[PDB]
């Protein structure tokens, strides 16, 4: 607790060797996620390969870079945001995102935070006795007293995605027991092998590629059927085209055989 380091250049020095030891380096966001949730998330990572420290002591990827030949300076705009960590890993890029991003733990929203997604409150009895119903009304949640209990009149959106949640708004929602978001280490960024990946990449489609694969597979298949080029898959169809076309000439015409 006392004045003694609280190190400077020493913890940087441990950190120096840590980007260099591991191939894959992640820039990640704790801010939202509780620490039973973070600490559990980190338990997963830790078996595989581990996370270490900084401020601006983090931004010093430059010294690490300077030791090797890899980036500077050169990077697009140093992506770091409030509340950032570095994850040093063996684990390839694509898999790291699926562990972290898919498996998030739940928790409540916060006052003065920008809502990540649309917020709704449901209609039904709150179960609470008469009191300051007014507080609910202030937010733009309609309520009225039915059967001597406070009830919310209708489902409505209290706050949208990309708008901030007001201090009153948050508190009242917590009393309702309404939470809902997914928390865990938001991925800002990846370095691997001289290459910079931003977060759009990092949510990694995949269903779209199945559709594209199957469509590519059909292009090949099509080409095969029509073209007549008989390795294993195409063959029985290619023979059929030469009929499809004969059987066919009969249907329009008006010679009967």
């Amino acid at each position: 607790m006392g004045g003694i380091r609280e190190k400077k250049a020493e913890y940087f020095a441990k950190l120096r060797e840590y980007l260099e030891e591991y191939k894959s380096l992640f820039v990640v966001g704790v801010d939202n996620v509780s620490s039973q949730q973070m600490h559990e998330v980190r338990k997963e990572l830790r078996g595989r390969a581990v996370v270490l420290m900084g401020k601006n002591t983090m931004v010093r990827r430059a010294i690490r870079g300077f030791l090797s030949d890899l980036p500077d300076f050169e990077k697009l705009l140093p992506f770091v945001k409030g509340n950032v960590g570095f994850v040093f890993t063996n684990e390839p890029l694509t898999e790291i995102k699926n562990v972290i991003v898919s498996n998030r733990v739940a928790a409540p929203a916060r006052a003065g935070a920008v809502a990540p997604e649309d917020i709704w409150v449901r209609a039904v009895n709150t179960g609470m006795e008469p009191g300051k119903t007014s507080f609910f009304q202030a937010l733009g949640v309609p309520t009225k007293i039915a059967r001597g209990t406070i009830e919310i009149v209708s489902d409505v959106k209290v706050v949208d995605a990309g708008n901030k949640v007001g201090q009153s708004e948050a508190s009242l929602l917590n009393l309702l027991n309404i939470s809902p978001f997914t928390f865990g280490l938001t991925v800002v960024q990846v370095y691997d092998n001289g290459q910079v990946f931003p977060s759009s990449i990092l949510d990694i489609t995949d269903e779209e590629l199945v559709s594209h694969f199957v469509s590519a597979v059909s292009t090949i298949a099509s080409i095969s059927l029509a073209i007549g080029y008989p390795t294993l898959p195409s063959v029985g169809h290619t023979l059929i085209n030469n009929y499809k076309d004969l059987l066919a000439v009969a249907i329009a015409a008006s010679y009967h055989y």
Partner: protein, 58 residues
């Protein structure tokens, strides 16, 4: 087929489907060149709309 897949990639890349161009992709794959099969393939593909064939098919 490696030869059919080679043709569709060559058209997607924007390069003509000929014996040299199929041979370079085929060699990069590591599959041995066979003169008869790429020659039939270029010949079958001659006079074709690759685009029009690609889309219908049962």
């Amino acid at each position: 087929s490696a030869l059919s897949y080679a043709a569709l990639i060559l058209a997607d890349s924007e390069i003509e489907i000929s014996s040299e161009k199929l041979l370079t992709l085929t060699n990069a794959a590591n599959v041995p060149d066979e003169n008869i099969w790429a020659d039939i393939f270029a010949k079958a593909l001659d006079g074709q709309n690759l685009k029009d064939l690609l889309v219908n098919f049962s």
